[PDB]
Design a protein around this ligand. Sequence first.
Ligand SMILES: C[C@@H]1O[C@@H](O[C@H]2[C@H](O[C@H]3[C@H](O)[C@@H](O)[C@H](O)O[C@@H]3CO)O[C@H](CO)[C@H](O)[C@@H]2O)[C@@H](O)[C@H](O)[C@@H]1O
Ligand SMILES: [Ca+2]
Length: 135
Amino acid sequence: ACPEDWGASSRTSLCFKLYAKGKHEKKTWFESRDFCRALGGDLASINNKEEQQTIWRLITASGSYHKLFWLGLTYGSPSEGFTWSDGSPVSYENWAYGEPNNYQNVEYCGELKGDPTMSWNDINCEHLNNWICQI
Ligand SMILES: C[C@@H]1O[C@@H](O[C@H]2[C@H](O[C@H]3[C@H](O)[C@@H](O)[C@H](O)O[C@@H]3CO)O[C@H](CO)[C@H](O)[C@@H]2O)[C@@H](O)[C@H](O)[C@@H]1O
Ligand SMILES: [Ca+2]
């Protein structure tokens, strides 16, 4: 069962929470990771299409579209490439077309574009974004 306002009560329920913020309250990737971990969780990992649908449904209920959200995507070693901050394997992927492109060699964190494509992009970790936690 999920904590109240993080999802449903069944044993198979996945628990995510959107944090959409104004520009003065958006966070870097590391700040967002630390925020979610302080609650006992982590930045959201998306391990399959079921989790993607869960998050998309939350976005549709939010009324806002096109927002950028930090996910738990962070580059590891050169051989690893992208990893999930929660330690789960990066099996499922939904990178946008051409991504990750490490544009100008400075993009080591992953963001979700909150539109129907639910696509991922690598971007400067120091950008201030919205974020999504999991527990
Ligand atoms: C593809 C992109 O390349 C770099 O970002 C460029 C930026 O791309 C926008 C794109 O125009 C927009 O349609 C899409 O929704 O978001 C992208 C940003 O994530 O466009 C500006 C000009 O407006 C610059 O050309 C940027 O270089 C790269 O930084 C992004 O990570 C991404 O791979
Ligand atoms: Ca990119």
